[PDB]
């Protein structure tokens, strides 16, 4: 639902690394793969941690809050 | 493409696949 | 007593025994019991 | 009266009465609590059964005759021939036709099934009595129906059931105050009326009101606190209570400012236009104590959106 | 469309989210229009009839049940409801 902290494998940290994905792909124009090896992602373990995750976080947030303050 | 009338490949199939779950979905029988 | 939540209006709201199962602002039927405000421990595991 | 034929478990080595016992359900035991001795083993839980109700149908077994996977219809017919001619069951036949005519009634209203149960309940209660010998069945059917609305809180008016029983009202109303002697006689015989039962309740007819005029929940809201301040008043007080929520209803319509006109909020709550206007005369001179002041305070409604005479 | 009535008698819009919540059942009501006819006529004895209206022909809606209703149908509300509409009302999309 949000991406993993740390890389189901290896134990690297992925978690900090979503936003700068995402921002590589949209405004520097870059593929997904060179976006992965400029994070510092070498092993394909990592790679897929980044490249296959599904952020359904977005979906949820949509509706409206159960309990407001 | 380049000319309206050249044949289309294997791949542009997949276009008209596209078009056709935009239109019905995957549940038409049962909503129709 | 306890408070109670509608579950379309978002509405706070505080219902004894005897009164009845409504929102009273805009009218829903369905209520969520509020969160326990007493402190719940978790593992990080 | 008779043999006891009780089993009580007590523990002979503790010997303290009444004994702490538990009952392991998980490990079909019964142990004494205090010093851990078992008391009986084997304990059963508590399809091949039916589960009936003793309370509208009491002891009645009874088993229907019907087609298997090969019958022929010969037998099918001269066996329910049979049936039919029973003297024991006759008597409760009665009984039993009425319940299924008063689930017919019901169910023709849209009314919930406690409602029915209630209404069934009632008729069996007073039924086979004898002061309800010389009444229109039709009577005893409406006046357990409107008995059953009042017990399960959302009570019809007379006018409402009478649009379904046809019944005149001297035999309704004395039916319904015969009926509820026999509930309070033999509610101390052994409860049956509470603060619901009373006759009024006017409460209740509002939300059905103004649910029919299409009105939001936030006039319902304000023409209950209409209704129930309009008790203060004794020029109103002793009217009708239909007259009552009606002309509330009313002043909140035009307080609101609702395009709907008093020649069909009387058309369709069936009540004479002048009693609405009449009434509206005696209430509009306590308007200042017959709206709600949050609503006021907060500015959605003003005393003078109402139009004066 | 679809519609709930309560038990005290008021009945308003039904979605299909309180519908779940609440254990009912999503479905519209059907009303026909009836309209009724009554002829007469004198019937001599030995000869065919010939009936004729007798000015009494009555012609309301009248309940006949409730039909539920499948979702994301033309007689659903979730039909007519974008996707921000459908999140309004606590519906995936
Ligand atoms: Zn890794
Ligand atoms: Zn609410
Ligand atoms: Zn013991």
């Given at each position: 639902?949000?991406?993993?902290?740390?890389?189901?494998?290896?134990?690297?940290?992925?978690?900090?690394?979503?936003?700068?994905?995402?921002?590589?792909?949209?405004?520097?124009?870059?593929?997904?793969?060179?976006?992965?090896?400029?994070?510092?992602?070498?092993?394909?373990?990592?790679?897929?941690?980044?490249?296959?995750?599904?952020?359904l976080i977005e979906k949820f947030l949509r509706y409206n809050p159960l309990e407001k303050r | 493409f380049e000319d309206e009338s050249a044949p289309i490949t294997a791949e542009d199939s997949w276009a008209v696949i596209s078009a056709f779950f935009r239109e019905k979905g995957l549940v038409s029988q049962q909503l129709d | 007593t306890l408070k109670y939540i509608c579950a379309e209006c978002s509405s706070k709201l505080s219902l004894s025994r005897t009164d009845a199962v409504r929102c009273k602002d805009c009218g829903h039927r369905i209520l969520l019991k509020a969160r326990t405000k007493r402190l719940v421990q978790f593992e990080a595991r | 009266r008779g043999p006891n034929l009780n089993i009580v478990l007590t523990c002979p080595e503790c010997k303290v009465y009444p004994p702490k016992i538990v009952e392991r359900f998980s490990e079909?035991?019964?142990?004494?609590?205090?010093?851990?001795?078992?008391?009986?083993?084997?304990?059963?839980?508590?399809?091949?059964?039916?589960?009936?109700?003793?309370?509208?149908?009491?002891?009645?077994?009874?088993?229907?005759?019907?087609?298997?996977?090969?019958?022929?219809?010969?037998?099918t017919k001269e066996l329910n021939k049979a049936q039919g001619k029973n003297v024991m069951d006759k008597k409760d036949n009665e009984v039993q036709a009425a319940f299924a005519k008063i689930t017919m009634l019901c169910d023709a209203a849209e009314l919930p099934k406690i409602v029915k149960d209630c209404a069934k309940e009632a008729y069996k209660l007073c039924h086979d009595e004898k002061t309800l010998k010389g009444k229109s069945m039709e009577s005893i059917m409406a006046a357990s129906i409107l008995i059953g609305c009042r017990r399960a809180e959302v009570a019809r008016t007379f006018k409402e059931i009478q649009s379904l029983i046809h019944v005149k009202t001297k035999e309704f109303g004395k039916?319904?105050?015969?009926?509820?002697?026999?509930?309070?006689?033999?509610?101390?015989?052994?409860?049956?009326?509470?603060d619901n039962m009373s006759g009024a309740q006017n409460l209740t007819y509002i939300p059905r009101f103004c649910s029919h005029l299409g009105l939001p929940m936030q006039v319902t809201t304000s023409a209950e606190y209409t209704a129930k301040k309009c008790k203060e008043i004794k020029?109103?007080?002793?009217?009708?209570?239909?007259?009552?929520?009606?002309?509330?209803?009313?002043?909140?319509i035009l307080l609101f400012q609702i395009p709907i006109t008093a020649a069909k909020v009387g058309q369709t709550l069936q009540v004479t236009e002048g009693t609405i206007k009449s009434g509206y005369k005696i209430l509009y001179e306590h308007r200042d104590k017959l709206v709600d002041p949050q609503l006021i305070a907060n500015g959605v409604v003003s005393l003078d959106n109402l139009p004066g005479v | 469309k679809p519609m709930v009535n309560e038990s005290d008698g008021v009945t308003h819009a039904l979605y299909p989210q309180e519908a779940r919540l609440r254990n009912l059942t999503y479905?519209?009501?059907?009303?026909?229009?009836?309209?009724?006819?009554?002829?007469?006529?004198?019937?001599?004895?030995?000869?065919?009839?010939?009936?004729?209206?007798?000015?009494?022909?009555?012609?309301?809606?009248?309940?006949?049940?409730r039909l539920p209703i499948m979702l994301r149908s033309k007689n659903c509300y979730l039909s007519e409801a974008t996707e921000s509409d459908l999140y309004k009302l606590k519906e995936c999309p």
């Open positions: 639902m949000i991406v993993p902290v740390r890389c189901f494998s290896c134990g690297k940290v992925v978690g900090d690394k979503w936003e700068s994905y995402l921002n590589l792909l949209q405004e520097d124009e870059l593929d997904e793969g060179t976006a992965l090896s400029r994070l510092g992602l070498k092993r394909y373990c990592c790679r897929r941690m980044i490249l296959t995750h599904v952020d | - | - | 079909g035991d019964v142990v004494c609590a205090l010093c851990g001795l078992v008391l009986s083993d084997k304990l059963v839980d508590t399809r091949v059964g039916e589960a009936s109700n003793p309370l509208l149908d009491g002891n009645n077994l009874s088993t229907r005759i019907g087609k298997g996977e090969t019958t022929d219809m010969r037998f039916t319904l105050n015969i009926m509820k002697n026999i509930l309070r006689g033999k509610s101390e015989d052994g409860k049956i009326d509470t020029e109103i007080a002793g009217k009708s209570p239909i007259t009552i929520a009606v002309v509330s209803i009313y002043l909140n | 479905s519209s009501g059907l009303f026909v229009d009836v309209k009724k006819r009554t002829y007469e006529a004198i019937d001599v004895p030995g000869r065919e009839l010939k009936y004729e209206l007798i000015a009494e022909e009555s012609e309301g809606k009248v309940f006949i049940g």
